[PDB]
Write a protein that binds this ligand. Structure first.
Ligand SMILES: CC(=O)N[C@H]1[C@H]([C@H](O)[C@H](O)CO)OC(C(=O)O)=C[C@@H]1O
Length: 622
């Protein structure tokens, strides 16, 4: 939890009571565990929705959906049960409550089970399952000079009639919402990303939506891959971005421009960025994933536990900020090494809040945190992005010519640097350095082991540059200070840790020729360069094809396959001005300035503009 931030235990395990209704009688009952937080703002009223697991935190036990609400931004709350289970058995339950806010209404989607003690995806059929929608109506009043609010919950309605018996290539079994908070699309549709099973017990995600305020429901034709559960979605630039949990694998993210009719993996932005554990080989988690506007910039906030402990412990709840280009690690929301899996982040009246789980010995509470420090950090970072984007866009390029493009600009290494790091102007991913001397807008390297390393898969659990495996443009200005003994590296994308296995790179040789390297293709030296002269270098990769440009012109060999149509590359890092490896035999004596990383292949005009504007883009004077 960041400095300045604070929290309270709002839903207190084995302490907090809820009004338990049974057989026409209501009694204040102590709840064992509270899980699956959903925190929203309804017309000024804060509402926290969750599971009230009365007797145990076991998934298949007695559960009602509880709600707490506040009209004073979380200082005091009123408590109620929003949805009660069927009361058919000692393990009847309404589960995975998923919330949509529209106007003054709360739409809550829950699975309902009567008596099964087995985990839902293990069920061979749907005999024990129903899917329900309850609507809560929020009213505000001022009886007494003070703001008050009340929420009237309606009876749940089964949506089972809207679940087709078959979907493309399968027979349906059950479905549930993805928990947390879903959305109202810009066209007014209620949209729930849902997790669905078929009769083969496979799980996948779908879009489940309503065009008539929840009276009838439809499924989008498309789907995620199998294995994608607990989806959470938001709308961004006209598309739904569906962010899925994949147990024991990296999280898959999809985009859909047609209400789920077609799904495309977001390989160029967010897919496979977030891992569920350091080695991405443990169970995943529910995630808060929202689009908000902070100081005029539309951005996305995403949470997920780091899970250093493994299994479902899911310690270290972390918060991420992204504009669909850069991906910033705001930091750890939870405290110390506590288990803290599920969460819900709310941005209301320029204040940031998070309702999240804490778990000790499988007894769960929900803490309500005021994320003061986090918002401060977020605002600073967004200012930096807006500022550098503004700076680059404002440059009068030589004939003013076309503007330098910032669309897809993810990283920028320029003037800022410490003894051992080259700092990302966008503040997301620094490069490590060796044998580097600071110069205006860059670094001058020399000696065996010299260079800088801008990590890709080397980022570890969370891989912000995963997009580079699909497409990228890497740009830099370079100057060679000594003729090498053989062939020496200048810039490239490495597939392994050494730099010996390259995806695409540029070297230079003793005969004053360039050596562009295209994957494992035999190298053909070409062109010519002279010592002390500055050159503009661009490496592009898209559709498995690599190109290398010098001074805005493509070199011989460009347009070559760098990826066997077989697999998808797993780039380790970009190397700059050397390999940064004392064990590699080369000595690169060169200066590199203004390294730009884009998440797409730049077009000819964009490359020319960068070439012509080399002397104008540095961060030095700012
Ligand atoms: C119906 C059910 O068992 N829901 C469980 C959910 C489920 O496994 C799936 O991943 C998304 O609902 O996951 C988790 C979990 O802590 O990992 C808690 C829920 O109790």
């Amino acid at each position: 939890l960041a400095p300045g931030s604070s929290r309270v235990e709002l839903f207190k395990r084995q302490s907090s009571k809820v009004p338990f209704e049974k057989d026409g009688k209501v009694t204040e009952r102590v709840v064992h565990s509270f899980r699956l937080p959903a925190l929203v703002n309804v017309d000024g009223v804060m509402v926290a929705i969750a599971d009230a697991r009365y007797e145990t935190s076991f998934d298949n036990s007695l559960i009602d959906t509880v709600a707490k609400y506040s009209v004073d931004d979380g200082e005091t709350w009123e408590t109620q049960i929003a949805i009660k289970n069927s009361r058919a058995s000692s393990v009847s339950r309404v589960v995975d409550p998923t919330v949509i806010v529209k106007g003054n209404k709360l739409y809550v989607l829950v699975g309902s089970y009567n008596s099964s003690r087995s985990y839902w995806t293990s069920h061979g059929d749907a005999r024990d399952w129903d899917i329900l929608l309850a609507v809560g109506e929020v009213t505000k009043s001022t009886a007494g000079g003070k703001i008050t609010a009340s929420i009237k919950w309606g009876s749940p309605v089964s949506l089972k009639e809207f679940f087709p018996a078959e979907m493309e290539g399968m027979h349906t079994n059950q479905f549930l919402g993805g928990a947390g908070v879903a959305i109202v699309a810009s066209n007014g549709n209620l949209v729930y990303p849902v997790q669905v099973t078929n009769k083969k017990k496979q799980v996948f995600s779908k879009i489940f939506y309503s065009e008539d305020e929840g009276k009838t429901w439809k499924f989008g034709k498309g789907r995620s891959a199998f294995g994608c559960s607990e989806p959470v979605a938001l709308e961004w630039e006209g598309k739904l971005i569906i962010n899925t949990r994949v147990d024991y694998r990296r999280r898959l993210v999809y985009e859909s421009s047609d209400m789920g009719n077609t799904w495309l993996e977001a390989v160029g932005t967010l897919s496979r960025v977030w891992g569920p554990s350091p080695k991405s080989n443990q169970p995943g988690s529910q995630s808060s994933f929202t689009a908000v506007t902070i100081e005029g910039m539309r951005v996305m906030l995403f949470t997920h536990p780091l899970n250093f402990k493994g299994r479902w412990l899911r310690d270290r709840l972390n918060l991420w900020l992204t504009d669909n280009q850069r991906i910033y690690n705001v930091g750890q929301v939870s405290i110390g090494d506590e288990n803290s899996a599920y969460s819900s982040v709310l941005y209301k009246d320029d204040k940031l809040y998070c309702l999240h789980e804490i778990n000790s010995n499988e007894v769960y509470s929900l803490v309500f945190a005021r994320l003061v420090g986090e918002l401060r950090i977020i605002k600073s970072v967004l200012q930096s992005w807006k500022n550098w984007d503004s700076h680059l866009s404002s440059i009068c390029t030589p004939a003013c010519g076309p503007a330098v493009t910032t669309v897809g600009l993810v990283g920028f290494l320029s003037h800022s640097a410490t003894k051992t790091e080259w700092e990302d102007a966008y503040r997301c991913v620094n490069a490590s350095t060796a044998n580097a001397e600071r110069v205006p807008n860059g670094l001058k390297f020399a000696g065996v082991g010299g260079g800088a390393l801008w990590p890709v898969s080397q980022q570890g659990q969370n891989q912000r540059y995963h997009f580079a495996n699909h497409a990228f443009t890497l740009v830099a200005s370079v100057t060679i200070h000594e003729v090498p003994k053989g062939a020496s590296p200048l810039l490239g994308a490495s597939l392994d840790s050494s730099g010996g296995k390259k995806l695409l790179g540029l070297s230079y040789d003793k005969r004053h020729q360039w050596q562009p390297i295209y994957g494992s293709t035999p190298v053909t030296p070409t062109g010519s360069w002279e010592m002390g002269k500055r050159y503009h270098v661009v490496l592009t990769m898209a559709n498995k094809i690599g190109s290398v440009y010098i001074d805005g012109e493509p070199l011989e060999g460009s347009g070559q396959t760098v990826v066997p149509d077989e697999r998808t590359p797993d780039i380790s890092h970009f190397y700059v001005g050397g390999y940064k490896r004392s064990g590699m035999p080369t000595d690169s004596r060169v200066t590199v300035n203004n390294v730009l990383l884009y998440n797409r292949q730049l077009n000819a005009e964009e490359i020319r503009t960068l070439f012509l504007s080399q002397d104008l883009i540095g961060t030095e004077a700012h």
